[PDB]
Amino acid sequence: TTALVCDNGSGLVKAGFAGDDAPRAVFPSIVGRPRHQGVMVGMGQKDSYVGDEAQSKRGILTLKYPIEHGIITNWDDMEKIWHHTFYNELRVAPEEHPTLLTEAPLNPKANREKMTQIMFETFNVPAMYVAIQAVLSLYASGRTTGIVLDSGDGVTHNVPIYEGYALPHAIMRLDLAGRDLTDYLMKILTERGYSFVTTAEREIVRDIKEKLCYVALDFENEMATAASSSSLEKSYELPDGQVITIGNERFRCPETLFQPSFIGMESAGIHETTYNSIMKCDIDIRKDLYANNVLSGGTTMYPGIADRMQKEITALAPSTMKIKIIAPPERKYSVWIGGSILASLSTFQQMWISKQEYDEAGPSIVHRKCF
Amino acid sequence: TTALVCDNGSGLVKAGFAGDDAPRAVFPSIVGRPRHQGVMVGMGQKDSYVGDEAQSKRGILTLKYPIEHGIITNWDDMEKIWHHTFYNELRVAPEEHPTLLTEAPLNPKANREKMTQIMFETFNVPAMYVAIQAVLSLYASGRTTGIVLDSGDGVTHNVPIYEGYALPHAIMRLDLAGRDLTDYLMKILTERGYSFVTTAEREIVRDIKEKLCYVALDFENEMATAASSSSLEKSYELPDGQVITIGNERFRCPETLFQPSFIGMESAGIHETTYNSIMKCDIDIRKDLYANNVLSGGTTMYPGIADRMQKEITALAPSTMKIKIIAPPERKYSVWIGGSILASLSTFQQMWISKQEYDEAGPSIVHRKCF
Amino acid sequence: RFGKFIRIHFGATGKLASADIETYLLEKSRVIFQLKAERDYHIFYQILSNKKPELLDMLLITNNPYDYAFISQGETTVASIDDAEELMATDNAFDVLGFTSEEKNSMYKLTGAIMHFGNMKFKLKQREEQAEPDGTEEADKSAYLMGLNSADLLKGLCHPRVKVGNEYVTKGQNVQQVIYATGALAKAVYERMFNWMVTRINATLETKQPRQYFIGVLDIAGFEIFDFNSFEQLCINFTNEKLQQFFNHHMFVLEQEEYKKEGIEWTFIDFGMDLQACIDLIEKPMGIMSILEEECMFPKATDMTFKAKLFDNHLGKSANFQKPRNIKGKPEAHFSLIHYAGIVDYNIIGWLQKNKDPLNETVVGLYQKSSLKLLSTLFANYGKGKAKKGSSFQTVSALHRENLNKLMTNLRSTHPHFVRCIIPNETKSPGVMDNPLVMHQLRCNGVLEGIRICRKGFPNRILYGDFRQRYRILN
Numbered sequence A, B: 001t002t003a004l005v006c007d008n009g010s011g012l013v014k015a016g017f018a019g020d021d022a023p024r025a026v027f028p029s030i031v032g033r034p035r036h037q038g039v040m041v042g043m044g045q046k047d048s049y050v051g052d053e054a055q056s057k058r059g060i061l062t063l064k065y066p067i068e069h070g071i072i073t074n075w076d077d078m079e080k081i082w083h084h085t086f087y088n089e090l091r092v093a094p095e096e097h098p099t100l101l102t103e104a105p106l107n108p109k110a111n112r113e114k115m116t117q118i119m120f121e122t123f124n125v126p127a128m129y130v131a132i133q134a135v136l137s138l139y140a141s142g143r144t145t146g147i148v149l150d151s152g153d154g155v156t157h158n159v160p161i162y163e164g165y166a167l168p169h170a171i172m173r174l175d176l177a178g179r180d181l182t183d184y185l186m187k188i189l190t191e192r193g194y195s196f197v198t199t200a201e202r203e204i205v206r207d208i209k210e211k212l213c214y215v216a217l218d219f220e221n222e223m224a225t226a227a228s229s230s231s232l233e234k235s236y237e238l239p240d241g242q243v244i245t246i247g248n249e250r251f252r253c254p255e256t257l258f259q260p261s262f263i264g265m266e267s268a269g270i271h272e273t274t275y276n277s278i279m280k281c282d283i284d285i286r287k288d289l290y291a292n293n294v295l296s297g298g299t300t301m302y303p304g305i306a307d308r309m310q311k312e313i314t315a316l317a318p319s320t321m322k323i324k325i326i327a328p329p330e331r332k333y334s335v336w337i338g339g340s341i342l343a344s345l346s347t348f349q350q351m352w353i354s355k356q357e358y359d360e361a362g363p364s365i366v367h368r369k370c371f
Numbered sequence C: 001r002f003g004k005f006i007r008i009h010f011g012a013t014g015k016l017a018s019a020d021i022e023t024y025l026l027e028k029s030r031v032i033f034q035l036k037a038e039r040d041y042h043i044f045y046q047i048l049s050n051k052k053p054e055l056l057d058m059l060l061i062t063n064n065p066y067d068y069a070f071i072s073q074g075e076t077t078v079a080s081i082d083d084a085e086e087l088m089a090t091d092n093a094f095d096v097l098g099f100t101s102e103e104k105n106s107m108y109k110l111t112g113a114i115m116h117f118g119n120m121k122f123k124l125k126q127r128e129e130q131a132e133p134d135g136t137e138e139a140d141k142s143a144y145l146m147g148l149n150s151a152d153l154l155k156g157l158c159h160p161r162v163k164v165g166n167e168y169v170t171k172g173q174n175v176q177q178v179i180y181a182t183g184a185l186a187k188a189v190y191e192r193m194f195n196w197m198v199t200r201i202n203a204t205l206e207t208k209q210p211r212q213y214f215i216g217v218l219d220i221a222g223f224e225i226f227d228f229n230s231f232e233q234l235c236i237n238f239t240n241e242k243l244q245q246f247f248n249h250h251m252f253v254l255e256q257e258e259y260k261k262e263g264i265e266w267t268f269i270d271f272g273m274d275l276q277a278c279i280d281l282i283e284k285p286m287g288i289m290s291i292l293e294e295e296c297m298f299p300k301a302t303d304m305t306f307k308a309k310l311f312d313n314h315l316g317k318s319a320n321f322q323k324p325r326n327i328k329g330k331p332e333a334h335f336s337l338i339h340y341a342g343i344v345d346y347n348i349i350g351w352l353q354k355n356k357d358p359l360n361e362t363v364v365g366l367y368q369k370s371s372l373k374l375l376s377t378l379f380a381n382y383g384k385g386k387a388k389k390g391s392s393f394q395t396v397s398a399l400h401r402e403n404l405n406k407l408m409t410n411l412r413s414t415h416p417h418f419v420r421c422i423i424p425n426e427t428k429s430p431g432v433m434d435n436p437l438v439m440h441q442l443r444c445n446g447v448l449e450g451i452r453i454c455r456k457g458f459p460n461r462i463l464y465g466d467f468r469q470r471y472r473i474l475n
């Protein structure tokens, strides 16, 4: 048989068979319900649109994300997402396919317990396993050491690994992510004259963020340039017209990552959390962690983020170290590639949580050595 | 055939075939265990890193010396050290090679008996012999009289020998050695704001001690000079940057040898013990013993130790006696050179302890007159 | 090297009708990696013959074999066979065959293009781990020959496009990965050319007679033994061991048939599992081949780690894996297996690098978009249940196992017969013999295994009448 790798992620569900070079199905993790009445008789609208289908009917639905920051908050929506992924996207029966799942660090144990219970009971998967996003990202990056910064749409965290050994006491988790950037972009667009409130327009604001935003190497210099020059202004076409032009708002939204004080967060920027995590580790491995800084996740895809973070870390770090940042073009799908590599390994076949073990030891078997 | 000359010592295992000019394999005697869990699967980490390999993985290992002060306290680790030495560094099977061993004077008989038992049982060497670490150093210096000061990392001892006749009643042993100096440097570096606690960075502190520490000819004058001027300060580059500068601490660390009261020991200094051992012998050989002082061991490699020790012993000794101290450049490896010379002798071929003799007489053969 | 196989068809009335030819288990490692004292395929040396000047100048081939990187690593030339008239004979055979000379010229130019794949060079970039080419003249000439664009080919090699969900994204490649991809493409195109040539020969040979029951003829390389055994020899040994196990099973079936015919039936234990114990440590999961295939996927694998894993997973735990032996000053030995032919030791060094066969999808698409015949060779290459292995997840060993399995799904359907040929001496002189040579031939041919299996039962069978006319006089 063959193994199945499913990555719930946050804001995007991506899945595919193990041993593949890229996920087959990638679609937003959205469950929408019709908010109007409906007057035509005979068509028989369904009561729930799930997945990429909800994007097409975005204008007549209330889009709800089943997960806020890694933690699943609406379980029924998650059974709907998983059922859609397993049946209408891959068209496979999970009765004969082991499933590998990806899960962020420092999350409630009840989350993993319920995930495994749902997988074993509702879908009757023969075996399953839960892994950490950072380890998979390091797998796909062709590395065995180095500190990896995984910044998705749900949560941003750093996990330092040296020689295949993790440093649990040095793991730092920050809840600032892409969703907060989108919300700040909404909050900062209204000062120009454009108001976005409905959950349907969340997608439009996110698309504007993806298509136009970029990280500035220097903040004060760029603001001074934009205060006088107008070469930073670009137009965007809304799905109905009335093009909008944004000036300094394009490079101010991603600055929240390095300046979390913009949205009221007390913590420090990602460039500072990475340095703090490096200094948390032992003194004999700091050089290798400095020389093998790994990036992953969708939020790290902004143009010029690598140069800005390298400059910041070089400013923080001693002047006698070479700071190198690895930013492969496929940052977004790095975790799934690592999952495919991990599931395709032959020695991994004895680390699955089989059905017999789950039945014998209950849902608590997840937190054993089969972490 | 050829004979193997293994010198376990403490903190440095050095070995090689007899008749060689210098030892072939020199590496620290430490055993490392991974103190973390390991997240990457399929790598298959070994459960124990031994020898020079553990120096490259200091940041994810805990280092335990199997020899505290001359004696062996962890026999499994010592067996691992011996196996590594025989099978990786030298790549020679000990089935058809006699071995020559060294240990400090005044050691428990159980240690020697267990060493002999392990070496005939586990490795099945054809023959073996144990020699005093000081007599071999005396051979390596081309002398036949005089006293020898073997200040290693575990223990410091003096053995007066006149015309090849040892004087057991005048042997003085002192437990102050390089390890205590390293610990004292770790303790006194805290007053400058640098904290070293982990066993991994004890090696770093040892590197500073080797590279920068030196023995002062006068203590009060150097103290006044360091307190007034700042020309004695030097800077050392740590493995992760943040260069540090050590001043007055530069020569305070090796002064513990002449001032044992710094670490709380009641025993007298090195020079006083040497003088007491000199006057413990007869009266007709004191002049030759004065004129043939021999230094050996790693700890005696500090710059200016010879001049200070000569000045102190001249102050103690009568004025009409000529005092000379022999300090060859190869103090550290002198014991192994002497061992190789002794094993290359033709008359020594009948002093080996044959396996049949050990079987007939039991492990207590070594302490018997068949030494 | 390749496993030639000819099927001879017959008519309905038991008369000769037609012949069908197939090829199996062609080795690709020989194209790129060669032993120090061994040559490559005769193709490249034959092309470098100077008696045909037109091909060299029209292809812009360097006349010095030393310059080319793919060829100079092995032994440059030996007095095996004079290449000139052999090349002219092959050209004449092609000329008198069914297809025209333009296809022959396409063959030579494609081979020349395969030759120029070793001249590609790549270097690191300004402040990135990405790799960019430095020289482009060889790339330009290769693209000119293939009818491609040099810029497009370089962009495809450096930045392979991959499909994710519904959108295309670009992947990054370092120097090692691009070198592996360059080697894999050269091996794959050679394989496709050979298969297409075999299909063309089969079509030309084909007659219009109906094909009733056939008589298969199988030729395979023997159980070669060296003092420097490697992966290529390991695959051949494993194939020969599988064939020997098949022969043992067939002989056991024949013996049981004779026993049931004579009503003398005992010792029903099968004779297959005894040899299959060694097979189960190669092809099965947690076997040598499986561990090797997994190890190359781990991005920091090294030979020492691979050997350590083999020792951890097989030393003492299995009944066939054991320590190597150092005899008469042999250069290197890492592990020793036991086979039907005795003790064989293999060298780990160099196995990990040459096992990888990562193909590039965008380059295959560019070949399909080409203006030459090459698109025919690469016409088809690489949801409701899929197991398509990715381009990166491609190992030579997996292809070898798949080909051997598909061959066994075909050979097992026919009743087999065995023919053994033994060289009498190493020299040409008739009559004289070399006893160690005959020992080695007998050992690799499995005759000793046959007599050993026969000896455990009752091998001597005499009729009652003969026994009476010979042994009744005793009493």
Ligand SMILES: Nc1ncnc2c1ncn2[C@@H]1O[C@H](COP(=O)(O)OP(=O)(O)O)[C@@H](O)[C@H]1O
Pocket (backbone or CB within 6 Å): A008, A009, A010, A011, A012, A013, A151, A152, A153, A154, A155, A178, A179, A206, A209, A210, A211, A297, A298, A299, A301, A302, A303, A332
């Ligand atoms: N090119 C881009 N530029 C800026 N942001 C992007 C880009 N592509 C994706 N994103 C952001 O990344 C998020 C997707 O992150 P994702 O990798 O799905 O996280 P997870 O793995 O936790 O599901 C989207 O919300 C989007 O805002």
Ligand SMILES: Nc1ncnc2c1ncn2[C@@H]1O[C@H](COP(=O)(O)OP(=O)(O)O)[C@@H](O)[C@H]1O
Pocket (backbone or CB within 6 Å): B008, B009, B010, B011, B012, B013, B151, B152, B153, B154, B155, B178, B179, B206, B209, B210, B211, B213, B297, B298, B299, B301, B302, B332
């Ligand atoms: N030049 C030097 N300066 C300072 N310390 C030294 C020097 N040379 C050796 N040492 C110390 O001596 C110790 C090793 O002594 P060694 O003679 O190898 O002991 P043993 O023979 O018991 O192994 C080390 O811990 C090291 O710190």
Ligand SMILES: [Mg+2]
Pocket (backbone or CB within 6 Å): A009, A010, A133, A150, A151, A152, A153, A297, A335
């Ligand atoms: Mg993610």
Ligand SMILES: [Mg+2]
Pocket (backbone or CB within 6 Å): B009, B010, B133, B152, B153, B297, B335
């Ligand atoms: Mg010593």
